[PDB]
Design a protein around this ligand. Sequence first.
Ligand SMILES: Nc1nc2[nH]cnc2c(=O)[nH]1
Ligand SMILES: Nc1nc2[nH]cnc2c(=O)[nH]1
Ligand SMILES: Nc1nc2[nH]cnc2c(=O)[nH]1
Lengths: 289, 289, 289
Amino acid sequence: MENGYTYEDYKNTAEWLLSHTKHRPQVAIICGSGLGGLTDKLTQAQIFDYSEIPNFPRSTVPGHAGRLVFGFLNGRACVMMQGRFHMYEGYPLWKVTFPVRVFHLLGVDTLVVTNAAGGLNPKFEVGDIMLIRDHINLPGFSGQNPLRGPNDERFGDRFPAMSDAYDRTMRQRALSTWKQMGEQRELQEGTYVMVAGPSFETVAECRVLQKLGADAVGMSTVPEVIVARHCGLRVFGFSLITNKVIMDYESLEKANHEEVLAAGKQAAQKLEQFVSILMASIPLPDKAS
Amino acid sequence: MENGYTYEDYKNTAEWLLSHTKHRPQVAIICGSGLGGLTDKLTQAQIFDYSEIPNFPRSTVPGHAGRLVFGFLNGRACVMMQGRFHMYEGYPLWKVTFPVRVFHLLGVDTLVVTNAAGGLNPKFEVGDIMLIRDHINLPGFSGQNPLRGPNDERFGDRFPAMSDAYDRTMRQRALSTWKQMGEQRELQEGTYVMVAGPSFETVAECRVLQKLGADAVGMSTVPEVIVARHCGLRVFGFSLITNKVIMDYESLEKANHEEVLAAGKQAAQKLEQFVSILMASIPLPDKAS
Amino acid sequence: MENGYTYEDYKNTAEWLLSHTKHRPQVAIICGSGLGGLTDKLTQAQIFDYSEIPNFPRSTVPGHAGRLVFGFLNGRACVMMQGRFHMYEGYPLWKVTFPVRVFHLLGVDTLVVTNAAGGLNPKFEVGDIMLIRDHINLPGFSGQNPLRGPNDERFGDRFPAMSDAYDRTMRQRALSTWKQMGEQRELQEGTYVMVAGPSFETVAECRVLQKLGADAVGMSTVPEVIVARHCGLRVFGFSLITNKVIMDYESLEKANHEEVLAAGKQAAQKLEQFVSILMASIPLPDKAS
Ligand SMILES: Nc1nc2[nH]cnc2c(=O)[nH]1
Ligand SMILES: Nc1nc2[nH]cnc2c(=O)[nH]1
Ligand SMILES: Nc1nc2[nH]cnc2c(=O)[nH]1
């Protein structure tokens, strides 16, 4: 089905934003379920609710705190999308991913995407942090892909390969940094799988996902990632683990979202220090820097 | 995408039904492809075609026999949805699942769902009966979920866990009963996987489903189940097996739907006795019973 | 969701075509990404752009060369759909598959479908040719199936089995022929899996597909095949392999579509000789031939 948004539509929204803030972003950060904390630390903050920005999808119902704060963070200047969009919310996939495209028109040349995810690996302990190395997009195998439709050769190719989705150096540079702060627990790596559904995962299901080779399940990021790469954005991101089951031979836990708690603890504080430091290793342009 | 139905819409339909029958249901039974027999045995029968009930989706084309019979069965009073709704019929998932939600507004506190399913396990012999213990919902991994949209906090949470979908005691109580009737073949248990498609399963496909860990394939129940649990309905159900292939090294059968026959035999008679007796172990409320 | 097309709609389009060309097709060939060459070799050629044919979906944007050429090839008379329709193009599945249904109304009793596919098996070497023996349709597990809706009992059953999708003799007859031309490399066989998405496959993903048991991945054919069989069309086809990755432990290739090249070489010339000869083993009717 078409992409309602019309190139002119992303143009008008890039220019407008670009004409209301004297900040020319370089990095776009997308924070998820208990990582809006990463906001505060911006320095020359400048906030625009998703409501003024002309074509931006207004955020539905939650804690509502969903705005787009512009600022400078640890040397590089960036954009912070605080409270993103998911499928389970009823959004066509070209709506959730509108953010990522205006960004590309903004100047941005890096896209770091966080998200509070599952944890389907026995080695991970709630609270950890997983360096997304790859993804398994199940909603994409079926036709639900943000690129499904005619293509705007102004943005990217028709058949972009995702083989190298998440940058390599940025991931070594992150891998290093972790060492470099003298940190207790190690920042892991694995592959992430997007499940779309609002409800949580059956023990029966949690075993296919493990079987398929995923490491942490979730309901976001794969779209924004896919359309970033389409643009030649340099992507890469972390996943903050918070749980998961595997036993029906009999258990007696479940896994709520009340547990925005897990992230709503020091998983937050940590993931902030960790991305503030990382700003310092993102190749800046200028005239070769 | 929105859920057309508006809470007021399920309200009007609960009240109307609740004002046309002097029966206050406690259990809702949903019968599938050759289990409408379970109807007859109701005692103080009262039938409403899906056509009078104001917002109820009218049943498309088949043997047409799709009505909602109210009655009393073996001690408990119940609702019998005779001939349900599936995806392959062209129904948004919020249409098939309208039944389950009016029920919850009716008073009902248990939801037993039958369905004539595949059989992907070598140990099962056509005619058996599988006690659904869990599910693998593939149409849910992609975005096709009945909860996909804004959420009516009047019904349930936003992120319900399905970890414990199908009740435990009810399943021990069923497991026992089978013994308790002195029965020839044993009532099995395994996990059920919903495939949406009207056409049947390739031998190539039948091996992923086995690989993924399913025990019996089918085209229904997972939606009604998921939205039951959302409500705090107590769910649980059986699957009446009737076939399946696994060999392309060369075979020469196929599997029709003509075979509404399998169920359209003593798989029916059996699954009736078996759910009539089971009515006797469903905790009733009153004022603690 | 309904099938917009109304039987009368496929009727009008069959009759019109049937009244503009003095050719009564027997075989329908569908060629994909670099196999339109197979066109030239028709002998009593007769071309109709997808644009005149009244209800035919007009082909979107590409090299545009998307017309339907009627002719006689190697003894049998056929229809050649040059440049098909895919999901990633934004087409409801009942649009891509309109071709296959008018054909069935044309008289056609065989449907050979080519398609330039992946290659997920280590034994295959780019350039090969895979005799599609079976399929794994992932977009069908989720609800995206061309038969999803009311059913026109004029065409086929409601629950067609696909157990025997791709004909057996035709596949032995093809298997033989390969020998019979004294050919260097052997024409393989394996099972094909349809991924819908325009973007290409993650290394993470490429391993589920291998795991699931596929041999060559792609973004087409499964729909046209499924609806052919529904009609009792005799289907069968080849896949021309052209690539694939499996290593993220670190590699450094990707896989473009620029590589319409692979097919846009002697994979084309070969796949032409090979289907021209095969015309000679397709049982013709007449009055028993
Ligand atoms: N899909 C999914 N998303 C989550 N977000 C937080 N926990 C989970 C989980 O267990 N599954
Ligand atoms: N999906 C599916 N549903 C069925 N209903 C009855 N038999 C089957 C089967 O083999 N597959
Ligand atoms: N899905 C898919 N289609 C293709 N078409 C050509 N190569 C490929 C591939 O690698 N994947």
